[PDB]
Amino acid sequence: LKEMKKDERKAIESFINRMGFTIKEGHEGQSEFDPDIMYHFDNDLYMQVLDKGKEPPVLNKTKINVRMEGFMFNRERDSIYVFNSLTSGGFQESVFRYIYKYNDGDIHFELIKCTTGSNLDMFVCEGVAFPMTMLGNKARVRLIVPFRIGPESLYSRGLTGYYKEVEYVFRD
Amino acid sequence: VDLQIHRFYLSSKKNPDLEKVFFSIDHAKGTIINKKYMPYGTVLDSVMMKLVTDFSAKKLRVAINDGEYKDWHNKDSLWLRDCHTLHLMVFDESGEKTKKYTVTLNRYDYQPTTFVWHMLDGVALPDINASFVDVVTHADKVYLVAATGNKTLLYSSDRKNPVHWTLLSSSGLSGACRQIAATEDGRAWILTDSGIYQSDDFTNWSLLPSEVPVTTLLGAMAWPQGSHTLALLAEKEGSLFFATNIDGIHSWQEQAPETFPVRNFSTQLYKANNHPMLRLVGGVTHTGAPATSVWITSNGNDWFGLDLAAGAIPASMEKGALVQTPSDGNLYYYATEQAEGIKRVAVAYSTDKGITWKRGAADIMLPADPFYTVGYPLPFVCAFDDGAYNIYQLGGVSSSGTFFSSIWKGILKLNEN
Amino acid sequence: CDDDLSPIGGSIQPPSDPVSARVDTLEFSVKTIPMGDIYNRTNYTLLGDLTDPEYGDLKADYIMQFKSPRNFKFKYPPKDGKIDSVKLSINYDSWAGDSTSIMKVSIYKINKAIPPSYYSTQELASLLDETQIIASQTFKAGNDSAFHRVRIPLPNEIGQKIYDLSVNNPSVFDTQESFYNNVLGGLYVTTTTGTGVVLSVYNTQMAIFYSYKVAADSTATASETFVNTSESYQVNHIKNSQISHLLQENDSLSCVKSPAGVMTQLTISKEQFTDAFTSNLSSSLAWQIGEAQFNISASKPSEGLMLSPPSYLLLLPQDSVRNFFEQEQTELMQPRTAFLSTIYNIKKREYRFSNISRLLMEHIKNNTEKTPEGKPYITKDLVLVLLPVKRQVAGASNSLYTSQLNNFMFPSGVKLQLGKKNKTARIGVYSMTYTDNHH
Amino acid sequence: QNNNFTESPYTRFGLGRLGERTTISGHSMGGLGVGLRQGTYVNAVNPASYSAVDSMTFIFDFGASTGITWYAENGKKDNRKMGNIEYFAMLFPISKSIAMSAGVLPYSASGYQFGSVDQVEGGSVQYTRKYLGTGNLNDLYVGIGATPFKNFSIGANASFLFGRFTHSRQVIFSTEAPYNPVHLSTLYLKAAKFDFGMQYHLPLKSDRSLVIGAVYSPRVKMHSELTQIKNQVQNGVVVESETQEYIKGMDYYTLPHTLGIGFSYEKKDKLLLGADVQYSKWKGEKFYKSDCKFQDRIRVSLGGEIMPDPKVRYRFGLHGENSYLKVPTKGGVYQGYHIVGAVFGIGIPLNDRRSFVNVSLEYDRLIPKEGMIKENALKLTFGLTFNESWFKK
Amino acid sequence: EEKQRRHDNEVAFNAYADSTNFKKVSVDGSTAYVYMRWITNGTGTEHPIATSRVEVHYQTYRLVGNIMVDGNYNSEKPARITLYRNEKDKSITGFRIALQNMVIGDECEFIVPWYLAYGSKGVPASSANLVPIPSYSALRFIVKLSGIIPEED
Amino acid sequence: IIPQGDGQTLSLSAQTNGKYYQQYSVTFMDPWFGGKRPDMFSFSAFYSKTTASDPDRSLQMLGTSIGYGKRLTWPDNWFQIYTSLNYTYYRLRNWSYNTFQNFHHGSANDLNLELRLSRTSIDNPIYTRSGSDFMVSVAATLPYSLWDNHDYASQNLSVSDRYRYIEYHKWKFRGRVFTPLLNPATHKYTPVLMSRVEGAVLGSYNSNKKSPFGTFYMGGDGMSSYYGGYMNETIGLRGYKNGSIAGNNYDYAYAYMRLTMELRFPILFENSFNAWLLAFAEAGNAWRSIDNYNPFNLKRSAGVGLRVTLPMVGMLGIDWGYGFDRPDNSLQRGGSNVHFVLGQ
């Protein structure tokens, strides 16, 4: 298992310097985000807020739909899975309720399963729902989610997700 | 583990159709029966019997008709050209355990679509000169409508005994009968040159008020409880549109396709899925060419055609005749086909309640009337059903001038008894 | 170590200590009333027509609008521009009726704006002012194998216009209003004729299939999709007809039809509340209702029916029926006023609720007034309705909980046994009568 | 739930049964706590007796008890078993005359449980009614005694009183899934009590000795917090735990003035006789929502110790008292009751000539007026007095 | 391990014999047998044939643990099942043996041993069904027959 | 292992279970620090770490302590005051167990000053015949809540800001008494009467900020925790299940009291092998809030047992106890239970 952690550390290090990225440190409750700096948030999550958004969500009340575009990579092989909902059509939005519950770790979402066609419910994880603790409605972010807070289905394979752009909009 | 048969079938090197035949196996009585009859005229010269059995099955013995039990092997092509019963005996490796099976081959000894026909004696059909003639059966009464030039005549007779025909005194009617329609409760409509006329007794006719000049009366329904939907085809601008006349109220609907008939078509009203439905067969297109499609509908707003075979429906330039036998639910359509320069009668039959239609052989289905061997001088075909395995085929000769004279009654042979 | 209820104490008990138990029988009054327009947020729609002998008719169709992606700019410039086909796919998962009845589906193009509302409508007369026929095709529900789709070719003009607007024209695929007013309008999907089936359509797509980039010196088909989602506004036209015989008085049964249709309303009078609790003249007693069972037995459905009973029923007051679905709540979020039955199982054919005493407590609590000479009394009747709902579950197998509760959008019908003939509208309210004089 | 000390229904009113502040040796002599002056055990009743212990001693006094109680009624009978730890205290010297003591003693205890099963009125199914109650008011005390003037001694006890009393009443239905109601009342009490005692010990001719003692306890006002809850349960407690009322403050509960006079005659190592009278001014003291009328409480005790020349000391005693409250009799007026009792015990010495093992047996009877609960209780008490020689050079 | 699984499955099935209530039954010419009851008795004298398709309401249980694996009892329309048509369209042997003796209107419970239900093949959970069938599992069926499809179809 | 040398000792030990809970410890004491009087100066340091499954679910603790102990002669030449200064650093890596309330991921610091006064005059501690043992101890921390000015009443306060500096004030007391029924010189085999009283209170400066570190786990035999951390004191109550009184359902108490009366009958007295039979009666309880402290209505139990002393092993024994009362938040009495005691 520790080998998977080491391989993920190597993959993250080789990916961050592959394109121009400025890694900084982030503290909880941060409010001011440089629109050109990627932050490290102590939960191994990497965030670069392209737009802060609007009014913050209400806990255990707001239901949010997300549209994400990006791909997943490994230490040596990339583009194992590619997903897109912001540009290509034919994909139902993914809906989650904003909650807080410590079942095993920090869980900030309750997914509402979509039963009306093809979607990306298996690409919604803790890393995707985390930026809602700070940002607001109509929010656009870029994320690098390690396997620990990645999708639960793709946990054994130890894949690292890179979300090129995730957009959050309130309501169903 | 013991001795049983789970699947059994026949296959021929020269005949591949034996594989599709399915056999049902009853262990309680030990009988193998093909419940679907094998097609007439088949040949069973050399055939292999392929059967799926248990592993414990070791020895098999086959007896043909009343022959001898012969030790059977999987590589035997047996001879059963004239064989209708077969006996099978299965043994295990021990040899003492036995089980008997009887296989009976079901085949049509004659043509499955043969008909038997008879003259009706004493018939007194009126000698009437008319262009459009139709027959409508309600309860236990047949009514024949004829468009004699500019006028309209109606005659009545008994469904069971159509021997005697009586003229009816029509009151309120005017113009020439273009088309007729009727529901199951006896109410009838006739479209003439003037507006539509309505009656409940085929005698007293009231002019239905309207403004849009209708072009054809397709049919009538009684779907809204207490009302009477009336499907119509009218002319708007320079195209044809479907229309409804539900309780006098007029409405416009979808645009008719270009292959939709306007004249000399046969209509019928039936029921499916707890809903009245209309079926329309044959006719002449708006351009003038004949139409060879079947159109059904449920509300009169729009119609759609079925996916038939390669020209199963005969192409006719004049009125056909659509009849139904309700006891077996069979549909028949008689039309006039211009085959090799001669007007003959062609029959299209259906047994799947109108789902599928197949062209039939005229010489077997139709009567053997000598006067119609060389052609069909009359410009229309009339036929009405009876209610149980009985059809009437008005017309033996051309009579004194025009119109039919004699009546033919026919029964499907399969349902003779 | 001994646990037996000693009876010794009681001869020196204070006069205001002792308690007691009581039972009161309460009567419902049962009616069947039109359900009304239903709130529907999901993407499910119904397409087709149905006729049932004991339940009347239903005609369902809809109007849809496609979801516009931002900066569409689809790949692989089509060879010399242009495209090949614009086939539109209607996807359905299940149906009600006969899987072999032939229907005729027509696709029109409208030029109006879809009204903002999530309620199913009837008589959409204003929208269909001009319209324009695009396509029409016959189909049947069950097509063998598992190809549960309806594929309808469309004219190439709409796909060509979409492609043109994405390259040589401004990228207007930004706001939904701009996409609806410039790129593509609203599509009206209906069945012009035929009867016997209703499809539960869950989405509809419009695949624009183009040639490809030249691909060295070959070419290989590629395509777009343009699905519709629940973020936009649809129009569901659900119309139930000839159900007037279900609304007439019949004192042994009450019907609940699902798509709009009819529902069962239960009314407890005010006097029945007044001379069963509070009341009296001492004004020192009080009631604490602790048990009130309520179970309903569904009548055995007759053979030949096309509609089957709904799996779940929701019992809730009629006043809280709007805000229950507009806020997308769940029976676990209002445990005091909304109750969910159990699975309709053909072994016993009954919907079993449980102790509803909290509902009666809630009704008594905030509807008790006093006449000028004391005499507390109830001022309003208790009105409840039974609705057919669709429940979506989640959680582990041992712990299953109601994740989502929506209004049921599929043809169904049930005849419950509630009336005066066999005393089926009876509840036995078990209460505790203590005394309390600290006022 | 366990009640440990008592399950008498009479403890439903007031602060329950009023306990005493005597150890095993004092209790075995009928409750003699005022007149006794012996430097061998703890005599927390009269603090002036502290200044009688030897110069190098650490007396640690433990104790426990068990027993049975028989309750009788109009026609019914019942019996219950008790058993618990009575107290524990310590006493050591401080200077040439001054001594100090500490420990934990019970001030009062209360507990009961009863009810019955009946049929739902105007119905068919059955239901159970249960009335429960527990409560304890403890006492953590520190005392000091001295003898400044010859043949005269004084003492003072400072006590911290903390306690809790709960009374509950409930009905249990017998259905598929009911909401059983429980009406509950909780009361928390804190205070600070003081006791002042004086003693005069005149040595008579030869070996005879006379002891005369007095003890006084001022009125105490107690800080109180009362809560009334109305719960509904299905298997565990569920929603609607509504609190009906909550009242907090002082000046709602009081403890009365107490006076005690005791006399004792002691022939050394041969004979000890003593008696004492205690008066409590419970009349007119406040108690919020009390369902009874208080009355002045009188306690009379008399006992003796005889040991011949094995060495086992013998103790006997008789005590009586009147009730301090009037419970409401069924269909009548507030009435009281009396209590009488007899105690006999032994005081076996041990090998180191300093420790003691005491075993006592007590029988007491409650005498009501008429038509009330009758109680006869038997009790066996086992003590231990560990006397070690500390403070040695 | 699995051998002990076969052993306790067969010891349980065998106990369902002496459990007097449930008579043993078999089809003609087969040593195979299935233990069955007669919860309800129907009207009619038409038994299904080995090649007949019958629509029923059914529930399936394992003998070990009695875990529900399949069932359509929470629906009004009966499900159509075929006894035996070919190697692709069929059902387990015990199901055929049980249904060949019933009649329209019956509701019977029958115990099918491991070697008549699935043998050693085993049923992986896969999609749809979530509870897999362990290899060599005896089954407990409750089947209510509603009618018989004619062979003409 | 006692590395005696340099006029002092350097005893040390380390225990690691075969699956987790690695721990190491070193101790260094000076019996004659200063060179004038037997004033103890002890220094002890230790480290311990304990651990889909668990990727990095790990609890680690760095501990250090100093202690100066005296041999006071003011009351009498037996009182032994003892002052110590202790510090412990807690760090967590996603600790799923509801141990330590909601502290799951952060890290906390503990700094306490301990003052203890005791008097012990018993004979050989293996089998005591006469004497006493008394102890009163206090352990307190710095009230950071009065200076950091962080409002703990609200819920929005950060988890790191909440569980970072531990505040409490813990009090303990204990007293044991032994007495021989018969003369030790005349009879070697003599019954021994024993009485034990002990209790503790864990207060808090702020009514909302309470230490998740150091709560009580009562019930059963009681030796240690085989699934969680060792930062919760385990108190044994014979006649009940393990954790039944307080600790099951993750309910940890903040005060407790236990009273024991025993009677020991010796059996074997040979060289270094002793064995005896004991009959005991116990009463105890533990409360989540201090206000419920009630030293009279406790949970009772009684029974018998057997003890054996063995060289290099320590003490081994078996006890049987019957619990008469139902624990709080339960509906079953203690019943009949068997407890094994290992070592002290």
Numbering used by the authors:
A (entry chain J): 32 to 203
B (entry chain H): 39 to 455
C (entry chain G): 19 to 457
D (entry chain F): 31 to 339, 347 to 430
E (entry chain I): 31 to 183
F (entry chain A): 503 to 553, 597 to 889
The authors write:
The β-barrel assembly machinery (BAM) complex is a conserved, multiprotein machine that mediates the folding and membrane insertion of newly synthesized β-barrel outer membrane (OM) proteins. Cryogenic electron microscopy (cryo-EM) structures of the BAM complexes from the gut commensal B. thetaiotaomicron and the oral pathogen Porphyromonas gingivalis are similar and reveal a 7-protein, ~325-kDa complex with most of its mass on the extracellular side. Remarkably, besides BamA and BamD subunits, Bacteroidetal BAM contains a 14-stranded integral OMP that is intimately associated with BamA. The remaining four components, named BamH–K, are all SLPs and form an extracellular dome-like structure over BamA that may provide additional functionality to enable the folding and assembly of the many β-barrel–SLP complexes that are a hallmark of the Bacteroidota.
Tagging PgBamA at the N-terminus led to low yields of intact complex owing to proteolytic degradation of the periplasmic domain, presumably by the ubiquitous gingipain surface proteases characteristic of P. gingivalis. A tag added to the C-terminus of PgBamH (PGN_1735) allowed us to purify the intact complex and determine its cryo-EM structure at ~3.2 Å resolution. The composition and architecture of the PgBAM complex is very similar to that of B. thetaiotaomicron, with a pronounced extracellular dome formed by BamG–K. Only very weak, not modelled, density was observed for the periplasmic components, possibly owing to clipping by gingipains, similar to what was observed in the isolation of tagged PgBamA. All components of PgBAM and BtBAM are similar in size except for BamH, which is 88 residues longer in B. thetaiotaomicron. Structural alignments of individual BtBAM and PgBAM components show high structural similarity for BamAGHIJ. The highest Cα-Cα root mean square deviation (RMSD) of 6.3 Å was observed for BamI, although both PgBamI and BtBamI consist of an N-terminal Ig-like domain and a C-terminal six-bladed β-propeller. The extracellular dome of PgBAM is much more compact than that of BtBAM, as indicated by the distance between the BamJ and BamK PPIs. A total of 12 glycosylation sites are present within PgBAM, mostly located on BamH (7 sites). The tri-acylated PgBamH lipid anchor is clearly defined and, like in B. thetaiotaomicron, positioned at the BamAG interface. EL3 in P. gingivalis BamA is 39 residues long and contains 12 tyrosines.
